[PDB]
Amino acid sequence: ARKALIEKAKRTPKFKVRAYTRCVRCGRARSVYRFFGLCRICLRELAHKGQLPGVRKASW
Amino acid sequence: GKGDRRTRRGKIWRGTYGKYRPRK
Amino acid sequence: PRSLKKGVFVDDHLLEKVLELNAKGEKRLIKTWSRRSTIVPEMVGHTIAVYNGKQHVPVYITENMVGHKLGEFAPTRTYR
Amino acid sequence: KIRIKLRGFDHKTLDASAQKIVEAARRSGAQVSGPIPLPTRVRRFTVIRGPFKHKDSREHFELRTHNRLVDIINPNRKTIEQLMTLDLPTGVEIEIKT
Amino acid sequence: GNKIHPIGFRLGITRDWESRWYAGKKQYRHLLLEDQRIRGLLEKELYSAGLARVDIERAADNVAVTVHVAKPGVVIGRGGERIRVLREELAKLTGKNVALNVQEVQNPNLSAPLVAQRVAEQIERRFAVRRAIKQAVQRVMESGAKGAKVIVSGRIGGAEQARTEWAAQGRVPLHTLRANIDYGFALARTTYGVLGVKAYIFLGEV
Amino acid sequence: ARRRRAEVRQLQPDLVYGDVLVTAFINKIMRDGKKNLAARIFYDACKIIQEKTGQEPLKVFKQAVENVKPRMEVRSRRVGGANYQVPMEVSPRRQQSLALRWLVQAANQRPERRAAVRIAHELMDAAEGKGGAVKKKEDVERMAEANRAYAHYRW
Amino acid sequence: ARIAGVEIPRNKRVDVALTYIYGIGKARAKEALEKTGINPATRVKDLTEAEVVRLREYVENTWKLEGELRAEVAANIKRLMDIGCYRGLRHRRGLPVRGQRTRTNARTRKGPRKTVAG
Amino acid sequence: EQYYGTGRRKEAVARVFLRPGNGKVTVNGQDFNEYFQGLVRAVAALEPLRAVDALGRFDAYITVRGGGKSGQIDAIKLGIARALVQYNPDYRAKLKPLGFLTRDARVVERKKYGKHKARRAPQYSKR
RNA sequence: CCGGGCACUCUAACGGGACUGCCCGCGAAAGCGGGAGGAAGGAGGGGACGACGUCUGGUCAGCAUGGCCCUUACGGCCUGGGCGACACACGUGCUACAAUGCCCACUACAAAGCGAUGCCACCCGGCAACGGGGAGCUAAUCGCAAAAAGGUGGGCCCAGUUCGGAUUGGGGUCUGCAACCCGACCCCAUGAAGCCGGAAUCGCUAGUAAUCGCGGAUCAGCCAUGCCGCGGUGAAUACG
Ligand SMILES: [Mg+2]
Ligand SMILES: [Mg+2]
Ligand SMILES: [Mg+2]
Ligand SMILES: [Mg+2]
Ligand SMILES: [Mg+2]
Ligand SMILES: [Mg+2]
Ligand SMILES: [Mg+2]
Ligand SMILES: [Mg+2]
Ligand SMILES: [Mg+2]
Ligand SMILES: [Mg+2]
Ligand SMILES: [Mg+2]
Ligand SMILES: [Zn+2]
Questions:
Q1: CA-CA distances (angstroms) from residue G57 to F130, G26, G63, H120?
Q2: Which domain does G57 fall in, by range?
Q3: Most buried one in C56, E123, F92, H35, CB count within 10 A?
Q4: Contact, F143 vs F67, CB < 8 A?
């Protein structure tokens, strides 16, 4: 996203309401997971790399 | 029917509880 | 069916400034921005110009409408 | 009785170091309760393959966290010796409470 | 378009995750960004070395930030004049204080992450793509490998219009898990424009 | 079915008469996949035949069926212009299906409220010799033999 | 009989027949059929000139149904209008009130479609 | 005095114990015709016995847990066929023709993406 | 439920098993047809997996990135509005138009998941949502949970009607600094179009379609009938 809009990490937003994850790396606000603090993209990126332990390619 | 709010299945579907769907 | 609850809300901004105009007797027009702010008896007579998002609309309050909210009287959009 | 809950991300690494914390406790004490598996708690992920539109793709990712027990009989006081802190694996995290 | 990252497609088998440490819960989202910051600045420097893999291990405080390279004698700096300043920058990240026990890589031309780096380096230096390629292929196919392959992106030669240069020899099956093929990506910025370079090196088998 | 002549997937016998025809019928009756109530509906009517016959239920059934199955039905065949309505003998398999399907169909076409009544009174009209069942039947044969002028466009 | 202002349910069940009343629904029934104890499932035809009275007196003078009701509601709307209330508006301009999408599906409030040359 | 044939089905396991008894077949502390109250089929489960002229000349106590009444109706029909042979082996002989001894592999398929359910695929237009 | 015990179910690792290997028929062979054994038979059933390349495909609003353009505004903070407008048009869906159904009471089996400021047992007040009080759990051992359809019983009796819940008036709870614009949920009243859909058109070949309900992600709350998974019952038909 823009740069200003990366102040989310502002401990004092004013009200816990404005607390929006926003991907850590890309900053991708949408598709952001919790268990990873990542957007559906960066997720699948590293996943394929292998920098996320236990995280395998689901099959069943 | 499966969509009438003030009824039995109306809650079962709308996913709720009320005077029309208590517990025990 | 408007659910405020068991603890009404009114953004102080004017609450204080409107409650004070009563001390001098009355005033002459105001102008809120918290159209979200409910309404109380101490309005009757006043004139709180609310924002539409573009302008400051003079909403002449009245007994009948004392229970409503500023916003319902400041029309947002335009059409025909 | 010694509660040992071995939980790792892989069925080998972990499971392996859970056939150790027994031998080193099969002589110095009760023949143990053998290592008990316990079902796995899986965290599943699915994400639109590419970015922008194309929502009819997805690809799937899991995260199986296996479990293990073992459990023994009477803190032999002399078993803790063969065990104590002679570990070695790093892809595990077992907690305790006998 | 068709295809995957055989690496992420082989983790189940022929490939152990970069970071091999159980944990999770209210920590995974943490002990994760950890590595990122690690292998993050960790690349900003060791570029000159052959920074291939960079495993990571944990279990309790005492981490294990390894690092492979083809230029170990570079990591060290001077008996310990470098391998120190850096293990210090570690407390500016992992306050959890960790090692750094380095290791080395045999033949920097089988380490895909590098083979590609090189082809990139070359290219970034205004080199002859298709030539460098047919070379790297050899630098790699010409040392043990059962098969390799290199792929340079577009804007070849600077061409005002994207292209794609191939080249590769010997078996390089990918639809086969039992494969084991180091995959190496290499970015390669340029005066006129970016352009990655992929590196595939099929070795061993079963 | 471009590959092979699909097999006439046999069906399990009836939980009573142990018949297959009967089953098939129950199957046609059932909807939304509720073999239960259907087993009933039909069975419940297998009885109603009695209150109106000293006859046996099964026979009545067999007769209703073996009576509504057609012999020659229409069939299109466009040829260098417009599509003609051609006849032709009828398959021993398309007999059954085309019949049952019509019974359970004509049944649900009646005024009777209690579902089972319908089917029940329907098999009867059927086995007997009239009603919507044999209607749609003797209404197809009549369709062919009305275009029997295309015995040259066989197959 | 003629319970609420001029009523006429008959031949049917009662907990059903009362329904045919304005301020009466499948709810205010059971209540009245209890606050006045009556075997619910009885054909109104088979009603006691004695119960019809308690039933009437209750329902009539216990609520605000029929005629008098139709006027109250209309009164709130008519009121809603008098003041520049948003809601008081959508009513004037035949359009959904409770915050709904007036683009697609809006028929019920708007009625028949007025298809125009697009 | 005792026999045990299993029989699973669509995720339904049935422990089928067989005892020489006169034939008081029953399930989870609930009469057979009482766990399968008005379920046309059910009877099926016993077909195996009914098939070996048994039925009345043999008693059965059975368990079951998992799946749906039906599935159980089937699983049970299996154990009752399994232990039934776990008893007399020369029993398969003509118990196999019908095959009341063959784990019904047919199991619910998965839900693939971009669909509504394995096969049921979204409909479209202007094409 | 406590002692007791791993035989069974299961939980989860590891192997075993099936190869046209066996018998008949045909063939030059591959292999095709049929039969026995067998849990399964000829790729047993479903996934992950998509070749050289094509469409100058999509995305410089994910991220990276060559050039260009603005640097007191094409940057930045904020508050209110907007993304939610409406005379209409199309797409994908949901709920129906009913008696193989709807309603109340009682009663019976699932699988996969989630749970720290979180799942909330049990008791209490309230018609209710929910509020107050409060046990256990870091969770095969406690909670979300009830599965629903189904089964035994009784209600309606073919009616726009006990079908159908749109729309609108009124009262109220929970999240949040704040629900006018613009949230969901409950109780009451309201009870609309709709009685099976023109020309045309979509899906699916077996545990599938059809049908019933359960969880999850995101997330304070929610506009999820959507998306992604689970399992219950369980067909028709394929000449060609
Ligand atoms: Mg940026
Ligand atoms: Mg938020
Ligand atoms: Mg209804
Ligand atoms: Mg999507
Ligand atoms: Mg879609
Ligand atoms: Mg393949
Ligand atoms: Mg283009
Ligand atoms: Mg474009
Ligand atoms: Mg929008
Ligand atoms: Mg009406
Ligand atoms: Mg009708
Ligand atoms: Zn990312």
A1: 60, 19, 10, 59
A2: 1-71
A3: E123
A4: no
Q: Out of A41, A53, A57, name the one closest to residue D61 (CB).
A: A57
Name all chains with 3 or more CB-CB pairs below 8 Å to chain C.
Answer: G
User: Cβ of C68 under 8 Å from any chain G Cβ?
Assistant: yes
Domain that holds residue D51: 1-98
Residue H5 CA to I20 C1' — how many Å? Answer: 32
Query: Is the CB of residue E119 less than 8 Å from the CB of residue E133?
Result: yes
State the residue range of the domain holding C50. Answer: 1-80
Domains of chain A, with CATH numbers?
1-60 (4.10.830.10)
- Is D47 in CB contact (< 8 Å) with chain H? no
DSSP state for residue F92 in the 8-state scheme = H
Residue E61 φ/ψ region, left for φ over 0, alpha for ψ in the -120 to 50 degree band, beta for the rest: left
Tokens 């573009």 label which residue?
A: C54
Q: How far apart are the first and last CA of chain A?
A: 36
CATH of H1-127, one of 3.40.50.1970, 2.40.160.20, 3.30.230.10, 3.40.50.2300: 3.30.230.10
Minimal CA separation from A52 to chain E, in Å = 7
String of b and e for H103-113 (b: at least 16 CB within 10 Å)?
eeeeeeeeeee
Distance CA D31, CA D21 (A): 12
Q: Which of A31, A44, A55 is closest, CB to CB, to D63?
A: A55
| Domain residue extents for chain E | 16-106, 107-206
Residue A36 labeled ligand binder: no
- Which residues from chain F sit within 8 angstroms of residue H39, using beta carbons? 36
In the beta sheet, which residues pair with residue H18?
H60
Q: List the one residue out of H84, H83, H77 whose CA is nearest residue H100.
A: H77
Q: Reported resolution in A?
A: 3.3
